[PDB]
C-alpha cells in the first residue's frame, strides 16, 4: 500500500508566457468578500477559502480583461469552486434542484424567482455578464453550465452507488464536470468578442477547446488526487485507470501525465491546422486561442500557488514533486 | 483485384422485437409524399426516386401508436430530413451554414419567421403543427439536436471538400449527429403525448439507450447505404473509414460493423435491465419512450429492404440472398 507518489513534470515543459492581469489584487480581494457573503461562509470553510486564490487563477487565465470583465470572471470562478464543493455532499435529487435554480437565474434573472444562495449568486454575476456579453457566448455559457450540472448529477449517482466508472465513460463525462467549457465562453466575454457559430463550431476550434479542457482537467486529476482520495472519490482518472488496467498508483499517475503532454501537442497540432476567415475574424480567433493558451499555462502554475491541492506546501512541491498522501476519512482496511 | 460485391451480415433474422405498423400508415404516407413533392418542388428523375423512398412506411413502423395527426407530423419530418440530407450532399460548407440558419430560425418561430427558402418554408409547415402539441422539453430537444445535426453535416461537408476520410474515433463521434437519430427520438416523446423531465431523460441510462439505438440505426445504415454512397466516393461511412484506418478489405470492414451492430443491441438490453424507478407515472412514460427506441431498431432494419433507396427494386431479394452487387462509380477508381 503506497504512502506517496511522484508528480510528473508538467510545468517545465510548458513554454507559453505566464501573464497576470494588472487588475488582479483589488478584484481578487473584492470577489473573495462577494463569495463569503453570497455563500454565507463560516469557519472552517472561510479560512480554507482564503487560500483558494481563484482570483489569481482567473487573472492568469484572462490577463487582458478590463477590471469590470475580470471581476465577472472571478465571481464566476469563486462561485464555481464553491458550487463544486457544495455538490460533493449533495445527493442526485438535490443536484437537479440546484441545477434548476441556477439555470433559471442565468436564463431569466428578472422573472425567475428564487431565494437559494446558489441562484442568488448566479443572478448577481450573470446579470453583470449580460450587460456586455454577446448572444453567442451568452448561450454557450448557459448551455455548457447546463451540461456541467447534468454531468455532476451523473457523478453524484456513481458516488451514491459506490461505482468507479470505466475509462471511456469517465473521459466523456469528465469533459463536462470539469467546468472548463463555460470558462471558455468567458474568454469570448472578457475579450469583448462573440465568435460566429460557423467559426466557434468548426472542428479545429472545437478540437483546440477539447485539448485545453483535457489539459486543465486531466492535470487537475493529478494535482487533486490527494484531496479527493481522502473520501475515496473515484471521479478522477487515477483510480479509474488503476481499476480498469491494473496500474499501481505511480503507473496510473504517469499514464495521465503522458496524456497531458499529448494533449498540449494536440493543441499545437490543431493550431497549425486553423483555417482563415479573413482578417477581422482571424484576429478574433487568435484572441480566443490565446485565452485557451492562457488557461493552459495559468492553471498549471496556479495549482501550486493555491492552498487547495498542496496546502501550504505548493511552491515547495512544485520544486521537489513528491506528494505524501493525506489520511483517509475512513482507513482503507477498516 | 478490387471487389465487385460483398455479403450483408444478417442483422434481421435474430432481432426478436415485434415489428409493428401504425394503423394510419397508408393514407398518411400518401399525403406526406404530396406535401414533400410540392414543398421541395421535386421534378424528374428525383420525383420517381422519391416515390420509392417509402419514408411514411418507415415512420409508421417507428411510431406505430401515434394518432393520424401526430403520425403526419412525423412523416413530414422524415420526408423533409431525407430530402434535406440529399440536397446537402451537394452543398458546400458556407451554404450548409446558410441552410442551418434558415431552418433553425423557422423552428424557433414557425409562423412569424420570414423566409422564401424551400427548406425553411417546409420547416415552418411541419413544425408549426408540431408546436400545436409538443411539450417544452421535447420541443427544445428537437431544435437543439437539429442544431447538432447541421453543425455535424457542415463538418461532413468540409471533409468532402478536403478529400479526407476521417479517423474512426472522430467519425463515430460526429456520426451520432449527422445521422439525425437524435431529433427522431424527440419525436418519440411528441408522438406519444409525453414530455419527459430533464432528470429522467438526461439520466445516464436513458442517454445510453438512446445512443445504443442511434448507433444501431446509423451503423446498420452505413452497411445498407455503403453501395449508394461509394458511387461518389462518399467516405462519411464507417466502412471506408475502417478500411483506411485498419487496412481491412471490404468484407472485413463490413463484418466489423456487423459485430458492432449486434453489440449495440446488446448494450440497449443491458442498459434496459438497469433502468431506475421514478415511480409508476414516470416509469410508464419511460417504458413508452423505450418502446419507441425499440420500434426504431426493428422498424429501420426491416424498412431498409422495403425502400428502394439502398437496394433499388431488389431489397426483398437481397434480404434473403444477402449479396450486394456494387454499383458503378461516377468516376472509376483507377481513372
Ligand atoms: Mg467536481
Ligand atoms: Mg471538486
Ligand atoms: Mg479534481
Ligand atoms: Mg447524410
Ligand atoms: Mg445520405
Ligand atoms: Mg447512409
XYZ file of C-alpha atoms and ligand atoms in Angstrom:
675
model
C 0.000 0.000 0.000
C 1.527 3.269 -1.178
C 2.183 6.294 1.000
C 3.293 8.836 -1.605
C 3.828 9.399 -5.300
C 5.914 11.469 -7.718
C 4.336 14.312 -9.692
C 5.055 14.244 -13.463
C 6.816 17.431 -14.504
C 4.212 19.358 -16.436
C 5.409 22.912 -15.795
C 8.990 22.862 -17.018
C 7.894 21.606 -20.422
C 5.328 24.353 -20.994
C 6.874 27.370 -22.759
C 3.826 29.641 -23.088
C 4.418 33.004 -21.359
C 2.738 33.282 -17.949
C 0.777 36.544 -17.716
C -1.129 38.242 -14.906
C -3.901 40.801 -15.260
C -2.859 44.210 -13.947
C -6.172 44.433 -12.004
C -5.587 41.179 -10.099
C -5.151 42.175 -6.433
C -8.126 44.527 -5.779
C -10.527 42.406 -7.870
C -9.498 39.146 -6.153
C -9.995 40.650 -2.653
C -13.359 42.138 -3.636
C -14.560 38.849 -5.135
C -13.410 36.968 -2.027
C -15.799 39.160 0.009
C -18.591 38.740 -2.543
C -18.311 34.937 -2.172
C -18.128 34.877 1.662
C -21.271 36.954 1.695
C -23.067 35.075 -1.071
C -22.325 31.567 0.197
C -22.613 32.640 3.876
C -19.205 31.134 4.508
C -18.202 30.458 8.085
C -15.286 28.709 9.647
C -13.708 26.336 8.883
C -14.560 26.786 5.195
C -13.954 30.561 5.310
C -10.276 30.154 6.203
C -9.853 27.382 3.643
C -11.419 29.696 1.054
C -8.912 32.486 1.736
C -6.165 30.165 0.444
C -8.051 29.150 -2.742
C -6.787 32.181 -4.734
C -9.239 31.748 -7.614
C -8.880 35.486 -8.277
C -5.218 34.861 -9.066
C -6.128 31.869 -11.270
C -8.610 33.978 -13.163
C -6.150 36.859 -13.562
C -3.631 34.496 -15.207
C -6.273 32.962 -17.489
C -7.829 36.299 -18.537
C -4.767 38.590 -18.286
C -6.077 41.224 -20.749
C -9.613 41.663 -19.336
C -10.542 45.124 -18.098
C -11.486 45.464 -14.431
C -15.265 45.113 -14.943
C -14.962 41.949 -17.047
C -12.265 40.417 -14.863
C -14.473 40.752 -11.792
C -17.366 38.986 -13.500
C -14.891 36.194 -14.347
C -13.540 35.977 -10.774
C -17.007 35.972 -9.174
C -17.902 33.088 -11.525
C -14.736 31.179 -10.601
C -15.267 31.624 -6.860
C -18.894 30.593 -7.350
C -17.792 27.522 -9.359
C -15.311 26.294 -6.749
C -17.910 26.862 -4.034
C -20.601 25.096 -6.091
C -18.297 22.136 -6.728
C -17.513 21.753 -3.002
C -21.219 22.040 -2.016
C -22.216 19.423 -4.599
C -19.635 16.967 -3.246
C -22.188 16.399 -0.433
C -25.411 16.609 -2.455
C -27.455 13.599 -3.491
C -28.794 13.235 -7.042
C -32.210 14.810 -6.307
C -30.702 17.937 -4.760
C -28.195 18.304 -7.617
C -31.096 18.632 -10.054
C -32.763 21.151 -7.731
C -29.590 23.277 -7.672
C -29.381 22.967 -11.464
C -32.965 24.190 -11.744
C -32.294 27.268 -9.540
C -29.045 28.375 -11.171
C -30.041 27.857 -14.815
C -33.312 29.635 -14.036
C -31.356 32.656 -12.815
C -28.950 32.607 -15.812
C -31.769 32.417 -18.367
C -34.297 34.783 -16.732
C -32.697 36.808 -13.934
C -35.657 39.222 -13.845
C -38.528 36.734 -13.933
C -37.021 33.665 -12.218
C -37.949 33.766 -8.530
C -35.618 32.034 -6.087
C -34.267 32.553 -2.583
C -31.467 29.972 -2.760
C -27.881 31.187 -2.337
C -26.714 29.345 -5.459
C -29.279 31.090 -7.652
C -28.968 34.486 -5.920
C -25.222 34.494 -6.656
C -25.917 33.249 -10.210
C -28.155 36.264 -10.893
C -25.553 38.632 -9.350
C -22.590 37.805 -11.598
C -24.593 36.760 -14.659
C -26.674 39.941 -14.760
C -23.341 41.770 -14.907
C -22.230 39.364 -17.703
C -25.413 40.258 -19.596
C -24.526 43.982 -19.683
C -21.820 43.237 -22.311
C -21.711 39.565 -23.407
C -22.749 38.806 -26.965
C -25.645 36.375 -27.591
C -23.331 33.601 -28.834
C -21.127 33.337 -25.764
C -24.109 34.074 -23.518
C -25.764 30.913 -24.771
C -22.514 28.931 -24.790
C -22.145 29.829 -21.131
C -25.688 28.803 -20.116
C -25.713 25.679 -22.314
C -22.339 24.453 -21.019
C -23.374 25.216 -17.439
C -26.415 23.011 -18.184
C -24.015 20.296 -19.374
C -21.985 20.784 -16.181
C -24.968 20.183 -13.900
C -26.193 17.172 -15.908
C -22.759 15.548 -15.672
C -22.327 16.320 -11.961
C -25.691 14.597 -11.339
C -24.175 11.524 -13.018
C -21.101 11.852 -10.739
C -23.401 12.108 -7.692
C -25.157 8.909 -8.794
C -21.890 6.994 -9.198
C -20.874 8.208 -5.720
C -24.139 7.034 -4.138
C -23.788 3.716 -5.989
C -20.141 3.257 -4.867
C -19.179 2.871 -8.588
C -15.838 3.582 -10.288
C -16.582 4.288 -13.969
C -14.741 2.713 -16.840
C -12.183 4.883 -18.632
C -14.017 5.779 -21.852
C -17.223 6.681 -19.927
C -15.175 8.695 -17.392
C -13.415 10.771 -20.100
C -16.721 11.563 -21.806
C -18.467 12.703 -18.585
C -15.368 14.445 -17.144
C -15.204 16.907 -20.045
C -18.459 18.331 -18.630
C -17.922 18.023 -14.859
C -14.676 19.983 -15.251
C -16.455 23.246 -15.902
C -13.780 24.230 -18.474
C -16.426 24.734 -21.177
C -18.195 27.698 -19.512
C -14.778 29.211 -18.703
C -14.141 29.123 -22.467
C -17.330 31.128 -23.045
C -15.889 33.662 -20.595
C -12.825 34.025 -22.854
C -15.109 35.475 -25.541
C -16.947 37.616 -22.990
C -13.802 39.001 -21.348
C -12.153 39.797 -24.695
C -15.248 41.663 -25.902
C -15.823 39.282 -28.836
C -18.688 36.966 -29.882
C -17.430 34.352 -32.350
C -19.863 33.271 -35.088
C -21.268 29.777 -34.991
C -19.519 28.693 -38.208
C -16.152 29.680 -36.630
C -16.507 28.503 -32.985
C -18.083 25.152 -34.039
C -15.553 24.491 -36.806
C -13.905 21.127 -35.936
C -10.416 22.626 -35.490
C -11.580 25.187 -32.927
C -13.733 22.532 -31.215
C -10.653 20.279 -31.064
C -8.464 23.012 -29.568
C -11.112 23.607 -26.901
C -11.232 19.910 -26.081
C -7.428 19.730 -25.955
C -7.410 22.601 -23.495
C -10.283 21.085 -21.472
C -8.369 17.798 -21.219
C -5.082 19.510 -20.275
C -6.602 21.523 -17.406
C -8.869 18.673 -16.313
C -6.505 15.713 -16.505
C -3.763 17.752 -14.841
C -6.277 18.656 -12.166
C -6.876 14.934 -11.675
C -3.168 14.544 -10.867
C -2.937 17.633 -8.623
C -6.269 16.943 -6.843
C -5.976 13.170 -6.434
C -4.659 13.703 -2.894
C -7.573 15.762 -1.536
C -10.069 13.559 -3.447
C -8.833 10.107 -2.294
C -9.391 11.226 1.349
C -13.119 10.426 0.878
C -12.464 7.697 -1.803
C -13.842 9.978 -4.524
C -13.354 7.917 -7.691
C -14.270 10.742 -10.159
C -10.603 11.013 -11.098
C -8.670 9.270 -13.882
C -6.133 7.709 -11.478
C -8.461 5.288 -9.566
C -10.321 4.736 -12.843
C -7.106 3.573 -14.517
C -5.962 1.561 -11.511
C -9.204 -0.411 -11.552
C -9.612 -0.813 -15.310
C -5.987 -1.578 -16.195
C -4.366 -2.930 -13.040
C -1.944 0.015 -12.794
C -0.447 0.823 -9.436
C -0.615 4.443 -8.206
C 2.555 5.758 -9.888
C 1.719 3.774 -13.019
C -1.684 5.454 -13.227
C -0.217 8.877 -12.412
C 2.447 8.513 -15.115
C -0.120 7.343 -17.700
C -2.187 10.501 -17.029
C 0.959 12.629 -17.183
C 1.677 11.285 -20.676
C -1.902 12.112 -21.709
C -1.259 15.684 -20.532
C 1.841 16.126 -22.714
C -0.053 14.539 -25.616
C -2.960 16.950 -25.339
C -0.717 20.029 -25.467
C 0.748 18.546 -28.658
C -2.798 18.050 -29.942
C -3.487 21.717 -29.153
C -0.400 22.908 -31.081
C -1.142 20.487 -33.936
C -4.664 21.862 -34.421
C -3.319 25.410 -34.048
C -1.335 24.776 -37.233
C -4.476 23.413 -38.957
C -6.531 26.553 -38.343
C -8.361 27.859 -41.459
C -8.751 31.530 -42.342
C -11.977 33.514 -42.267
C -10.341 36.780 -43.350
C -8.548 39.427 -41.264
C -11.214 40.626 -38.768
C -12.372 37.149 -37.785
C -8.874 35.702 -37.901
C -7.798 38.252 -35.340
C -10.666 37.327 -33.029
C -9.787 33.646 -33.404
C -6.180 34.412 -32.383
C -7.503 36.233 -29.281
C -9.662 33.235 -28.329
C -6.937 30.636 -28.735
C -4.564 32.805 -26.726
C -7.148 32.575 -23.955
C -7.030 28.791 -24.294
C -3.251 29.011 -24.132
C -3.510 31.256 -21.045
C -5.786 28.653 -19.379
C -3.140 26.032 -20.026
C -0.127 27.830 -18.539
C -2.126 29.774 -15.950
C -3.846 26.744 -14.414
C -0.695 24.599 -14.358
C 1.108 27.273 -12.334
C -1.781 28.407 -10.157
C -2.237 24.828 -8.932
C 0.944 25.369 -6.867
C 0.091 28.865 -5.634
C -3.311 27.713 -4.339
C -3.731 26.071 -0.950
C -6.451 23.855 -2.437
C -4.241 20.977 -3.514
C -0.933 21.072 -1.632
C -1.918 23.098 1.444
C 0.890 25.495 2.364
C 3.479 23.335 0.558
C 2.553 24.367 -3.007
C 5.739 26.219 -4.050
C 7.857 23.570 -2.310
C 6.032 20.687 -4.019
C 6.460 22.459 -7.389
C 10.223 22.010 -6.900
C 10.673 18.543 -5.418
C 7.468 16.946 -6.870
C 6.788 14.424 -4.034
C 3.196 14.139 -2.822
C 2.588 12.486 0.534
C -0.925 11.033 0.612
C -3.330 12.579 3.124
C -5.040 10.405 5.785
C -8.300 8.864 4.573
C -11.524 9.834 6.345
C -12.044 6.068 6.779
C -8.918 3.834 6.659
C -8.740 1.573 3.631
C -8.599 -1.594 5.809
C -11.495 -0.566 8.097
C -8.149 -7.142 -57.788
C -10.835 -4.769 -56.425
C -14.113 -6.366 -55.277
C -17.348 -6.154 -57.229
C -19.619 -7.335 -54.417
C -19.880 -8.086 -50.733
C -22.024 -10.137 -48.310
C -24.507 -8.488 -45.951
C -24.223 -9.504 -42.275
C -27.503 -10.961 -41.081
C -28.899 -8.223 -38.905
C -32.636 -9.023 -39.064
C -33.031 -12.803 -38.565
C -32.076 -12.646 -34.860
C -33.801 -9.363 -33.831
C -36.772 -10.545 -31.773
C -38.597 -7.228 -31.253
C -42.167 -7.317 -32.637
C -42.473 -5.399 -35.909
C -45.500 -3.056 -35.712
C -47.217 -0.811 -38.277
C -49.322 2.255 -37.489
C -52.993 1.767 -38.441
C -52.950 5.141 -40.239
C -49.849 4.352 -42.303
C -51.202 4.229 -45.843
C -53.247 7.481 -46.129
C -50.708 9.499 -44.094
C -47.835 8.128 -46.239
C -49.500 9.259 -49.478
C -50.462 12.698 -48.174
C -46.915 13.365 -46.955
C -45.402 12.376 -50.294
C -47.552 15.005 -51.990
C -46.603 17.548 -49.280
C -42.878 16.839 -49.869
C -43.099 16.886 -53.692
C -44.789 20.276 -53.505
C -42.584 21.674 -50.768
C -39.262 20.590 -52.325
C -40.531 21.273 -55.888
C -39.481 17.779 -56.878
C -39.097 17.057 -60.566
C -37.870 14.050 -62.551
C -35.799 11.927 -62.126
C -35.861 12.731 -58.389
C -39.673 12.577 -58.119
C -39.691 8.934 -59.248
C -36.805 8.053 -56.912
C -38.691 9.686 -54.053
C -41.821 7.595 -54.792
C -39.667 4.567 -53.868
C -38.286 6.030 -50.630
C -41.294 4.905 -48.502
C -40.400 7.116 -45.510
C -44.092 7.042 -44.467
C -43.851 3.267 -44.096
C -40.615 3.550 -42.111
C -42.196 6.226 -39.911
C -45.345 4.152 -39.317
C -43.151 1.272 -38.079
C -41.093 3.538 -35.770
C -44.133 5.335 -34.255
C -46.789 2.601 -34.565
C -49.041 4.014 -31.824
C -49.235 7.671 -32.906
C -52.611 9.021 -33.938
C -53.116 10.209 -37.509
C -52.258 13.846 -36.897
C -49.122 13.138 -34.877
C -48.021 10.487 -37.383
C -48.386 13.009 -40.209
C -46.071 15.490 -38.481
C -43.514 12.687 -38.025
C -43.744 11.544 -41.673
C -43.455 15.106 -42.990
C -40.288 15.497 -40.866
C -38.904 12.187 -42.141
C -39.587 13.083 -45.773
C -38.098 16.545 -45.136
C -34.978 15.017 -43.487
C -34.216 12.587 -46.273
C -34.785 15.421 -48.753
C -32.521 17.771 -46.784
C -29.800 15.148 -46.491
C -29.762 14.587 -50.276
C -29.721 18.347 -51.001
C -26.831 18.843 -48.560
C -24.775 16.119 -50.306
C -24.153 18.800 -52.930
C -23.801 21.846 -50.635
C -20.508 23.472 -49.730
C -19.756 24.384 -46.097
C -20.892 28.024 -46.461
C -24.242 27.070 -47.945
C -24.739 24.401 -45.238
C -24.439 27.076 -42.510
C -26.903 29.166 -44.532
C -29.452 26.330 -44.571
C -28.920 25.782 -40.848
C -29.642 29.415 -40.133
C -32.849 29.283 -42.170
C -34.234 26.086 -40.661
C -33.440 26.864 -37.002
C -34.958 30.322 -37.437
C -38.034 28.533 -38.793
C -38.200 26.024 -35.904
C -37.931 28.787 -33.339
C -40.682 30.937 -34.917
C -42.746 28.688 -37.183
C -45.384 31.299 -38.084
C -43.506 34.592 -37.969
C -40.110 33.634 -39.436
C -39.653 35.430 -42.752
C -38.163 33.249 -45.464
C -38.592 32.355 -49.091
C -36.317 29.282 -48.966
C -37.982 25.903 -49.545
C -36.035 24.250 -46.711
C -37.387 26.801 -44.238
C -40.881 27.054 -45.707
C -41.333 23.299 -45.162
C -39.806 23.607 -41.635
C -42.450 26.210 -40.827
C -45.157 23.881 -42.174
C -44.486 20.754 -40.115
C -43.068 22.426 -37.064
C -45.952 24.877 -36.680
C -48.137 21.746 -36.432
C -45.592 20.065 -34.081
C -45.766 23.011 -31.679
C -49.542 22.680 -31.502
C -48.980 19.718 -29.148
C -45.259 19.271 -28.343
C -44.183 19.862 -24.768
C -41.458 22.369 -23.942
C -38.868 19.650 -23.175
C -39.099 17.681 -26.373
C -39.544 20.883 -28.399
C -36.137 22.136 -27.313
C -34.596 18.664 -27.705
C -35.840 18.602 -31.275
C -34.446 22.080 -32.021
C -31.145 21.608 -30.238
C -30.441 18.228 -31.806
C -31.371 19.578 -35.237
C -28.731 22.230 -34.456
C -26.195 19.487 -33.672
C -27.213 17.752 -36.926
C -26.491 20.849 -39.069
C -23.191 21.538 -37.248
C -22.096 17.950 -37.865
C -23.148 17.897 -41.552
C -21.120 21.110 -42.055
C -18.137 19.110 -40.753
C -19.017 16.305 -43.169
C -19.163 18.875 -45.974
C -15.698 20.221 -45.040
C -14.308 16.676 -45.046
C -15.800 16.101 -48.510
C -14.324 19.376 -49.833
C -10.907 18.429 -48.417
C -10.912 14.865 -49.799
C -10.493 13.474 -46.272
C -11.577 10.134 -44.805
C -11.802 10.772 -41.008
C -10.303 8.511 -38.391
C -12.623 6.025 -36.702
C -12.806 7.752 -33.310
C -13.587 11.176 -34.803
C -16.000 9.579 -37.290
C -18.114 7.801 -34.669
C -18.403 10.992 -32.580
C -19.610 13.190 -35.440
C -21.737 10.458 -36.961
C -24.020 10.336 -33.914
C -25.084 13.815 -35.019
C -25.120 13.562 -38.851
C -27.457 10.538 -38.562
C -30.337 12.680 -37.354
C -31.437 9.944 -34.972
C -31.463 12.392 -32.022
C -34.344 14.593 -33.364
C -36.219 11.393 -34.311
C -36.048 10.460 -30.638
C -37.561 13.793 -29.618
C -40.401 12.920 -31.955
C -40.996 9.734 -29.906
C -41.979 11.982 -26.988
C -44.133 14.284 -29.150
C -45.896 11.381 -30.872
C -46.603 9.615 -27.571
C -48.045 12.752 -25.954
C -45.352 12.823 -23.236
C -42.629 15.319 -22.300
C -40.029 13.647 -20.124
C -38.474 15.714 -17.297
C -34.812 16.695 -17.506
C -33.737 14.473 -14.620
C -35.270 11.393 -16.286
C -34.307 11.809 -19.924
C -30.741 13.016 -19.193
C -30.190 10.220 -16.707
C -27.138 8.230 -17.951
C -29.127 5.020 -18.511
C -31.679 6.652 -20.846
C -28.954 8.655 -22.606
C -27.089 5.328 -23.101
C -30.192 3.567 -24.513
C -30.615 6.475 -26.902
C -27.006 6.254 -28.035
C -27.236 2.482 -28.413
C -30.333 2.978 -30.596
C -28.642 5.806 -32.565
C -25.632 3.520 -33.131
C -27.759 0.564 -34.294
C -29.823 2.612 -36.752
C -26.801 4.556 -38.004
C -24.145 1.866 -38.231
C -26.628 -0.531 -39.860
C -27.361 2.276 -42.309
C -23.657 2.589 -43.075
C -23.814 -1.050 -44.177
C -27.053 -0.790 -46.218
C -26.156 2.560 -47.778
C -22.460 1.877 -48.462
C -23.304 0.868 -52.035
C -25.097 4.081 -52.992
C -22.589 6.256 -51.066
C -19.456 4.694 -52.623
C -20.754 5.613 -56.114
C -19.462 9.154 -55.396
C -16.602 8.092 -53.072
C -18.507 9.472 -50.120
C -16.278 8.468 -47.181
C -18.761 9.507 -44.394
C -19.422 5.845 -43.685
C -17.693 3.560 -41.204
C -16.747 1.025 -43.940
C -14.227 3.236 -45.872
C -13.183 4.685 -42.514
C -12.329 1.188 -41.265
C -10.561 0.148 -44.484
C -8.344 3.244 -44.393
C -7.571 3.198 -40.659
C -7.109 -0.541 -40.102
C -6.219 -1.941 -43.536
C -9.269 -4.192 -43.665
C -10.672 -5.230 -47.016
C -14.300 -4.548 -47.873
C -15.814 -7.734 -46.388
C -13.651 -7.376 -43.290
C -14.862 -3.832 -42.603
C -18.498 -4.804 -43.336
C -18.222 -7.749 -40.931
C -16.635 -5.480 -38.333
C -19.597 -3.035 -38.459
C -21.874 -6.079 -38.318
C -20.406 -7.180 -34.976
C -20.721 -3.606 -33.718
C -24.412 -3.701 -34.645
C -25.010 -6.829 -32.594
C -23.013 -5.335 -29.710
C -25.086 -2.148 -29.590
C -28.387 -4.043 -29.499
C -26.874 -5.943 -26.571
C -25.893 -2.629 -24.966
C -29.534 -1.477 -25.310
C -30.787 -4.581 -23.500
C -28.109 -4.304 -20.792
C -28.926 -0.680 -20.027
C -32.615 -1.530 -20.210
C -32.211 -4.025 -17.378
C -30.785 -1.407 -15.006
C -33.265 1.421 -15.561
C -34.016 3.175 -12.239
C -37.540 3.812 -10.976
C -39.106 7.248 -10.621
C -42.493 5.903 -9.505
C -45.417 4.499 -11.538
C -46.414 7.591 -13.537
C -42.869 8.422 -14.770
C -41.991 4.736 -15.117
C -44.861 4.246 -17.587
C -43.710 7.234 -19.641
C -40.160 5.830 -19.668
C -41.433 2.433 -20.872
C -43.379 4.205 -23.604
C -40.219 6.071 -24.693
C -38.019 2.904 -24.582
C -40.551 1.036 -26.720
C -40.180 3.862 -29.251
C -36.420 3.244 -29.296
C -37.141 -0.453 -29.701
C -39.501 0.270 -32.607
C -36.722 2.314 -34.275
C -34.331 -0.658 -34.110
C -36.730 -3.234 -35.585
C -38.552 -0.839 -37.901
C -35.452 0.655 -39.529
C -33.870 -2.741 -40.090
C -36.865 -4.139 -41.951
C -37.687 -0.871 -43.733
C -34.180 -0.688 -45.274
C -35.127 -3.660 -47.527
C -38.614 -2.380 -48.398
C -37.354 1.055 -49.564
C -35.762 1.473 -52.993
C -33.175 3.871 -51.514
C -30.483 1.271 -50.793
C -31.211 -1.772 -52.985
C -33.398 -0.248 -55.730
C -36.089 -2.744 -56.691
C -34.094 -5.691 -55.214
C -34.459 -5.183 -51.427
C -36.547 -8.297 -50.772
C -34.218 -10.467 -52.841
C -31.185 -9.042 -51.038
C -32.792 -9.549 -47.641
C -32.898 -13.257 -48.441
C -29.711 -13.808 -50.517
C -27.557 -11.048 -48.854
C -25.250 -10.491 -51.874
C -24.692 -6.796 -52.639
C -23.509 -6.058 -56.200
C -21.504 -2.827 -56.083
C -22.924 -0.042 -58.229
C -20.718 1.636 -60.878
C -18.718 4.614 -59.607
C -19.290 8.061 -61.081
C -15.515 8.279 -61.627
C -13.743 4.863 -61.843
C -11.299 4.328 -59.027
C -8.299 3.937 -61.286
C -9.264 6.876 -63.538
Mg -16.124 18.414 -9.110
Mg -14.014 19.032 -6.791
Mg -10.264 17.380 -9.136
Mg -26.161 12.262 -44.600
Mg -27.298 10.428 -47.081
Mg -26.016 6.309 -45.236
